[PDB]
Design an enzyme around this catalytic site. Structure first.
Site, PDB file in Angstrom:
ATOM      1  N   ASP A   9     -22.657  15.157  12.263  1.00  0.00           N
ATOM      2  CA  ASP A   9     -21.708  14.169  11.773  1.00  0.00           C
ATOM      3  C   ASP A   9     -22.244  12.774  11.768  1.00  0.00           C
ATOM      4  OD1 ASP A   9     -18.293  13.354  13.149  1.00  0.00           O
ATOM      5  OD2 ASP A   9     -19.435  12.439  11.539  1.00  0.00           O
ATOM      6  N   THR A  10     -22.548  12.252  10.583  1.00  0.00           N
ATOM      7  CA  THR A  10     -23.070  10.899  10.466  1.00  0.00           C
ATOM      8  C   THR A  10     -22.053   9.729  10.659  1.00  0.00           C
ATOM      9  OG1 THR A  10     -22.922  11.049   8.040  1.00  0.00           O
ATOM     10  CG2 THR A  10     -25.034  11.544   9.075  1.00  0.00           C
ATOM     11  N   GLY A  11     -20.753  10.030  10.756  1.00  0.00           N
ATOM     12  CA  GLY A  11     -19.745   8.989  10.944  1.00  0.00           C
ATOM     13  C   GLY A  11     -19.438   8.648  12.403  1.00  0.00           C
TER      14      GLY A  11
END
Ligand SMILES: CC(C)(C)NC(=O)[C@@H]1C[C@@H]2CCCC[C@@H]2CN1C[C@@H](O)[C@H](Cc1ccccc1)NC(=O)[C@H](CC(N)=O)NC(=O)c1ccc2ccccc2n1
Lengths: 99, 99
Positions: free
Chosen positions: B25-27
Site C-alpha cells: 500500500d503506497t498511501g
C-alpha cells in the site's frame, strides 16, 4: 514516469475542469475525494478504512484526467482528509509496482 | 517483480519467523499489522485512517523479509483487516510506481 516512495506519491488530477492534488494509493479499492459537488447524480455508499466505516456519495462514470491520461470511472465523495486515487483508475492509467 | 493493479497487490512477508500475507500500500505512511505480539517491547501510538483514529502498539526496529529482501524498520500492531506494508519499508526494497 517513475515515482519514488520517499515522499507521498502526489499527482495533480483534473476532475470537473478543476485541478487538485490527489494521492496515488495502491491499497485502496476505490477512489475517495474530499466532499464537493460533481456534475452528476449520486447514490449512497458505505466503505471501511482502518478504524471504522465512512458514508460517502457515489458519482458514477465521471471523466477524470489523471496527469495526461484521460479516464472515466467511479469516484466516491466523502469526509476524507486526503484525496485518494484507488486501484480502479490506476489500472486504467497503466500503473504498476516495481522492485 | 512487476506487479499489476487488477488484483489487490498481495505480498507474503516473513516476520517473527512466521509467514503472513500483506498488502503493498503506497498511501500508508506506516506499516500496520494484524493484532499480535512479535519479538520486542512496545510503546504506544495512535494512527489515523479514513474511519477515524485507532490505537496501536509500536514495535521499533524489527526485521521483516519483504519479498526476499531482508529489511528493518518500525512495525505497528493493532486491529486491522489486513496486514499493511507502507512506504517506510517499501523504500527499503526499492519499490516504485510507474506508468
Ligand atoms: C494503514 C495506515 C498507515 C493507517 N494508513 C491508511 O489507512 C491510509 C491513510 C491515508 C490518510 C488518511 C485518509 C486515508 C489515506 C489512505 N489510507 C490507506 C488506504 O489504502 C486504506 C488502507 C486499508 C486497507 C484495508 C483495511 C484497512 C486500511 N484503505 C482504505 O481505506 C480502503 C478504502 C476503500 N474502500 O477504497 N479500504 C479497503 O480497501 C478495504 C478493503 C476491505 C475491507 C474489509 C473490511 C473492512 C475494511 C476494508 N477496507
Amino acid at each position: 514516469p517513475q515515482i519514488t516512495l520517499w515522499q507521498r506519491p502526489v499527482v495533480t488530477i483534473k476532475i470537473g475542469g478543476q485541478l487538485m492534488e490527489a494521492l496515488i494509493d495502491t491499497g485502496a479499492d476505490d477512489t475517495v475525494l474530499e466532499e464537493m459537488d460533481l456534475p452528476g447524480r449520486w447514490k449512497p455508499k458505505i466503505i471501511g478504512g482502518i478504524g471504522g466505516f465512512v458514508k460517502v456519495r457515489q458519482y458514477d462514470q465521471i471523466p477524470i484526467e489523471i496527469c495526461g491520461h484521460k479516464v472515466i470511472g467511479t469516484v466516491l465523495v466523502g469526509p476524507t482528509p486526503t484525496n485518494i486515487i484507488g486501484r480502479n483508475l490506476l489500472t486504467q492509467i497503466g500503473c504498476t509496482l516495481n522492485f
